Design a protein around this nucleic acid. Structure first.
Lengths: 109, 147, 272, 134, 123
RNA sequence: ACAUAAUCCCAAAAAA
RNA sequence: GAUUACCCCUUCUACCUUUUGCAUAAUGGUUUAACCAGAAAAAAUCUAACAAAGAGAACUUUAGCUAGAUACCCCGAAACCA
């Protein structure tokens, strides 16, 4: 039994107890419990539910918890042009957020 | 289970599966394409470029291969040595009359990507002009896709 | 100034070839007091009581013996710390017992279909020293632990951890403890190792015992097919059934290993 | 451990390194015999270094059994260079560099054990099965 | 009057600190270290740009394989998924194409169903 | 009909 | 980038100078350390002082005058003369 959610313009496969990092900040305080939408649901009894262009809010639910807001290792981006004397060095650190998936809710209709 | 921080999925490696391909009138080089697909492992959803997950393909009756058109006499295989004027032209006809298993193999030899994995997957390919397979005492999977 | 940076670079380069041992008293930079630690300990966790028992939980016999030793050596004055250890050992005793009872209740309620041997194995693995001590070190209990000789060694941190357990048992009661421990241990397991350590000896025979005990049916292994490979490993397809009904099927390199894995999958299959 | 060093001696470092690697790992006796009957300029010098190392081993460390001594490490460093003028034709002068070698010898007690034997079939069957499972 | 002091030596020390694990004089000499560092950063940017392309191609190959196992090709599967209003990315689709053959089998079944219904409605 | 080893970028193929 | 505590596979035509255009089989460099090549305010813009006056016995002035702050780097001849 696993689900497929969508956030920050990126789709992800989520399962219970899983830890998933999402881009930047969700504007949510650490320790709080948030709900996410559902692109797809697949039950391990081989029973799949796929809605379009979204799944049932009443039918299925996904609830996860935010651990903290971290920062990925610094990436060095440099642009260089040959004999134009053009060199631009920029160090960019991508912000991230740690989400702990806790409860995947499935109810019968 | 568990997945962490944007990672591609490959675990370790798996065991290759030996396949059998029939001869008798299938077009040369048309078989080499799919045989190269099986050689690379492009038919497997678990495929990886570096892992070299490709399988082992065994083809039979390579002399019974059939090339269309006038290309039988008109196809020229070039073999050149270091010595000056060592350029040799061998037609598909005479080559079939001498060493047929070379032909199809050459058709495969141009399909695969270069460098290492080419020869690596090339050693996974075996051809015979007639059917004798002691390796068939060892049970393998048979795939039939004639053209 | 260049002198301060040369001295900082020389100290940072001197620390590479020389590694000093970890000290417990000089560990924290700020002054370490009992009340500060127990206050933060009370603010983080839900409920915390019995500050005396909590402080006693991080007290070890080695520190007391060393202290009394220094008292005898110097001979300046004489004080009695004796009550601490005597009060701690009891909390540890009750702690171990109640931990066993609680975990037994957990395995009883969660997995009723689990045989006695499986219960014993899982309890032995869950109460194991290495795992619990690992959880300890991961929870940074070693920072709150007081050890004169060395902070690192497991006999300190483990007994300290159990003392903390018992302390939570007496002070906060069972209802809180059941919340605390049950959360961590499960999250720690995560593996197949749970049933693997019980499978270390005659997997087939164990399956025979389970089947004969439950459905009273002798397991039968039958080869359903074989796909050979001479080079790396041959693949044999081995079925395992009872009363003509197939329980499981699986591939193997050798007949023995194939039967082992088939018996393992069938072992976890009857676990539910 | 018994250390011995010789500095400010003038010989080719690359040439001395030949006899330096020769006695490395070898026992005291075999190294002695070798250096004795080895033909080169470094033979005598390294023989002297070895002899002095043995004398220091016996006298200073008071070793009970001389057979328990072997050569653990031997190395050759480069010292200062003496610049000389080599006269050539057509009024040109080349620079002849006279080199130097600092010989260092490190000895450790106990019986010498060195195994260069490696089974090909075992190593292959292990490394392949471990690489295929990773 | 000023001095060269430790500035240049510290800059060189930093560049060489970033020049570690490099081969030859490039992990030793300063100039070659810089020359290799520039190329290293350019390659960093370019490979980080083409990484998405490589992953996309790989995923497309995997999905193509899993599709061909069911008797249909990749483009037909894509079209069917488009007309099925499925916005699912090829990454997750490939992950399902590997770990969960059942879901991909269902999607392929619906694909063949939509294709047969369109071919029957067009006739 | 030009002068070192072939094919006008691999191998082949066919006539949305 | 992946991948294993190492590597093979995949993605990329040195730097500088000179040029319409150089990875170029155009130029310079063995490497390293160190040395080494934009220092001139008239009119102007700008910050302040006072204002038909400014400015330390000198000049300017139909809003000026005074002060401060802003832009124009090195090496090399063949030869001439004493």
């Amino acid at each position: 039994l696993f689900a497929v959610v969508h956030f920050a313009g990126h789709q992800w496969k989520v399962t219970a107890e899983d830890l998933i990092l999402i881009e930047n900040e969700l504007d949510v305080a650490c320790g709080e419990r948030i709900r996410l939408e559902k692109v797809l649901l697949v039950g391990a009894d081989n029973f799949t539910l796929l809605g379009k262009p979204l799944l049932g809010k009443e039918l299925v639910r996904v609830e996860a918890t935010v651990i903290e807001k971290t920062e990925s290792w610094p990436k060095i981006n440099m642009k260089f042009q040959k004999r134009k004397n053009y060199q631009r060095k920029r160090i960019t650190v991508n912000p991230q957020t740690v989400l702990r998936i806790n409860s995947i809710e499935x109810x019968x209709x | 289970m568990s997945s962490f921080s944007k990672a591609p999925q490959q675990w370790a490696t798996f065991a290759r599966v030996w396949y059998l391909l029939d001869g008798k009138m299938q077009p040369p080089g048309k078989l080499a394409a799919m045989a190269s697909v099986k050689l690379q492992g492009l038919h497997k959803p678990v495929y990886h470029q570096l892992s070299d997950c490709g399988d082992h393909v065994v083809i039979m009756n390579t002399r019974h291969i059939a090339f269309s058109g006038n290309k039988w006499e008109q196809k020229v295989y070039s073999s050149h040595t270091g010595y000056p004027g060592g350029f040799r032209q061998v037609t598909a006809a005479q080559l079939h009359q001498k060493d047929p298993v070379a032909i199809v193999k050459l058709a495969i030899y141009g399909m695969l990507p270069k460098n290492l994995h080419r020869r690596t997957m090339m050693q996974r390919l075996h051809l015979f002009p007639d059917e004798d397979i002691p390796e068939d005492i060892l049970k393998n999977l048979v795939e039939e896709l004639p053209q | 100034x260049x002198x301060x940076x040369x001295x900082x670079x020389x100290x940072x380069x001197x620390x590479x070839x020389x590694x000093x041992x970890x000290x417990x008293x000089x560990x924290x930079x700020x002054x370490x007091d009992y009340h500060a630690e127990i206050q933060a300990f009370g603010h983080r966790l839900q409920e915390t009581f019995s500050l005396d028992l909590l402080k006693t939980a991080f007290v070890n016999s080695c520190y007391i013996k060393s202290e009394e030793a220094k008292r005898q050596k110097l001979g300046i004055d004489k004080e009695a710390a004796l009550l601490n250890l005597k009060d701690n050992q009891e909390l540890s005793e009750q702690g171990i017992s109640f931990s066993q009872t609680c975990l037994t209740q957990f395995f009883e309620d969660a997995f009723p279909d689990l045989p006695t041997e499986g219960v014993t194995s899982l309890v032995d693995f869950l109460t194991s020293e290495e795992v619990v001590c690992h959880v300890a070190r991961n929870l940074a209990v070693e920072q709150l632990a007081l050890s004169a000789e060395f902070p690192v060694p497991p006999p300190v941190l483990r007994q300290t951890f159990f003392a903390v357990i018992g302390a939570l048992l007496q002070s906060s009661g069972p209802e809180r403890t059941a919340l605390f421990i049950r959360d961590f241990l499960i999250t720690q397991m995560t593996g197949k190792e749970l049933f693997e350590m019980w499978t270390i000896t005659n997997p087939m025979g164990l399956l025979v015992e389970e089947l004969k005990k439950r459905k009273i049916s002798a397991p039968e292994s039958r080869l359903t097919r074989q796909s050979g490979s001479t080079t790396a490993l041959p693949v044999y397809f081995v079925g395992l059934y009872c009363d003509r009904k197939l329980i499981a099927e699986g591939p193997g390199e050798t007949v023995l290993v194939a039967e082992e894995e088939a018996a393992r999958v069938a072992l976890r299959k009857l676990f539910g | 451990e018994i250390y011995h060093c010789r500095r400010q001696i003038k010989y080719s470092k690359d040439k001395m390194w030949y006899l330096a690697k020769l006695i490395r790992g070898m026992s005291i006796d075999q190294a002695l015999a070798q250096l004795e009957f080895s033909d080169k300029k470094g033979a005598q010098i390294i023989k002297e270094v070895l002899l002095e190392a043995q004398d220091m081993a016996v006298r200073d460390h008071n070793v009970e059994f001389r057979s328990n001594l072997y050569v653990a490490e031997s190395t050759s460093g480069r010292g200062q260079y003496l610049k000389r003028i080599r006269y050539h034709g057509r009024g040109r002068f080349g620079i002849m560099e006279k080199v130097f070698c600092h010989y260092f010898v490190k000895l450790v007690e106990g019986x010498x054990x060195x195994x260069x034997x490696x089974x090909x079939x075992x190593x292959x069957x292990x490394x392949x099965x471990x690489x295929x499972x990773x | 009057l000023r001095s060269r002091v430790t500035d240049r030596y510290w800059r060189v020390q930093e560049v060489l600190k970033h020049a570690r694990h490099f081969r030859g004089r490039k992990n030793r000499c300063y100039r070659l270290a810089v020359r290799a560092v520039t190329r290293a950063f350019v390659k960093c940017t370019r490979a980080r740009r083409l990484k998405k392309r490589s992953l996309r191609t790989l995923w497309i190959n995997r999905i193509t394989a899993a599709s061909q196992e069911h008797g249909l090709k990749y483009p037909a599967f894509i079209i069917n998924l488009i007309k099925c209003q499925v916005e699912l990315n090829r990454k997750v689709l490939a992950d399902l194409a590997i770990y969960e053959p059942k879901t991909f089998k269902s999607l392929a079944a619906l694909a063949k169903r939509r294709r047969x219904x369109x071919x029957x409605x067009x006739x």
